[PDB]
């Protein structure tokens, strides 16, 4: 996997790839690595697929119960902490789960990194998975707070593409999300095969590759 997420002026962008592996074998070309916890909360997935699905869907159960008891939506900070607390119970039992909890609440846009060690980090930008280093390269050199929604979506899209190309265990397609104060907005599934050639021509990048 490669996933990324970053805060900016108009909310938060979340972008993930869609590959799954079993050794050298590509076991799935199109897995959904984002979970729609609620209309204003997203969760990215990296690591053990089963762990990612089970625990993030259990988080959604627990975030829904929060709304029923309090009559109000859970904060991104509290949601990320519930998840990190789940990880601390199965501490050292061998789980493998790296995730970003993205959303919009009363403090504005929120982004938290959570992993199987019980780590919980707040920040403006994160990227997880086998191809996160490739994504960080593009993000760090092009990121601004003053990005437009159009330019921001492209940055997350282009950053996954960079990782999909170089990282053998990343690829398939790109899933884009944009989180606003009216909720998350899905910005489609983008095949990397087609996207690569498109970006190559329009941008002039990947000069070394022949097409």
């Amino acid at each position: 996997t490669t996933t990324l997420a970053f805060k900016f002026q108009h909310g938060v962008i979340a972008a993930v790839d869609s590959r799954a592996s079993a050794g050298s074998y590509i076991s799935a070309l199109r897995v959904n690595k984002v979970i729609e916890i609620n209309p204003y909360l997203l969760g990215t997935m990296s690591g053990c697929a089963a762990d990612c699905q089970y625990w993030e869907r259990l988080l959604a159960k627990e975030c829904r119960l929060y709304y029923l008891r309090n009559g109000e939506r859970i904060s991104v900070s509290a949601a990320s902490k519930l998840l990190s607390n789940m990880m601390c119970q199965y501490r050292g039992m061998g789980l493998s789960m790296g995730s970003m909890i993205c959303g919009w609440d009363k403090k504005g846009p929120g982004l938290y990194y959570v992993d199987e060690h019980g780590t919980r980090l707040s920040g403006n930008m994160f990227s997880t998975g086998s191809g996160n280093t490739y994504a960080y390269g593009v993000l760090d050199s092009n990121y601004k707070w003053d990005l437009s929604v159009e330019d921001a979506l492209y940055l997350g899209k282009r950053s996954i593409l960079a990782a999909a190309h170089r990282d053998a265990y990343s690829g398939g397609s790109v899933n884009l999300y944009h989180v606003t104060e009216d909720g998350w907005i899905y910005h489609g599934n983008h095949d990397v095969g087609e996207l690569f050639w498109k970006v190559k021509e329009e941008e002039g990048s990947f000069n070394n590759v022949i097409g």
Binding site: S24, I26, R166, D167, G171
Partner: protein, 204 residues
């Protein structure tokens, strides 16, 4: 750690009607990292073609070795080496390193210049010959290639049909292997003309 899967890559060869085809991907990697998209795995010594998968240093080394040996063969014999003879030379050369082998999966392809008979062969890293009539596969997606070749292949295909069959076998096998892809090349070989085609494929 496994030398046969550090760099990745695949090779496939097929027989047709009065023709043969051999194809390979272009990837070279360091495990998960893609390093080169121009690492061709097919070489030719006269009219005999050799594709080699496995550890890239041994691929390069063996090419240089068989170039060396076929150039001397030609000077002494006063003729180019034939596929059947070269196949035995490859087998001999690999087995001489029985207890310190080259981590490779070679594949020979060519047409006998005298008999006109199409010929392909494959080996394990230690020299055992697999002289198949239909097709030979090698690489990190060998299982995938076996499945594709076994279902797509039919005997006595014409050069321009064989091209489509071998290309589709390679492309779709590579797209189910993390360590293969990043481009592909197909050689279509006839008794006195050889065409080389670079395929367009997904670059992930």
């Amino acid at each position: 750690s496994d030398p046969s899967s550090i760099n990745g890559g695949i090779v496939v060869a097929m027989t047709g009607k009065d023709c043969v085809a051999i194809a390979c991907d272009l990837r070279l990697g360091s495990q998960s990292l893609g390093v080169s998209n121009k690492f061709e795995k097919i070489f030719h010594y006269g009219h005999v073609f050799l594709g080699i998968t496995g550890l890239a240093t041994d691929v390069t080394t063996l090419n240089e070795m068989f170039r060396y040996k076929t150039n001397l063969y030609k000077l002494k014999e006063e003729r180019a080496i034939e596929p059947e003879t070269f196949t035995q030379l490859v087998s001999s050369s690999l087995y001489e390193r029985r207890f310190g082998p080259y981590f490779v999966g070679p594949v020979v392809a060519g047409i006998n210049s005298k008999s006109g008979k199409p010929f392909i062969a494959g080996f394990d890293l230690i020299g055992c010959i697999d002289e198949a009539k239909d097709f030979i596969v090698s690489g990190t997606a060998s299982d995938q290639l076996f499945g594709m070749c076994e279902s797509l292949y039919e005997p006595n295909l014409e050069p321009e049909d064989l091209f489509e069959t071998i290309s589709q076998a390679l492309l779709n096998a590579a797209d189910r292997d993390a360590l293969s892809g990043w481009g592909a090349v197909v050689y279509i070989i006839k008794k006195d003309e050889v065409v080389k085609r670079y395929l367009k494929m997904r670059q992930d």
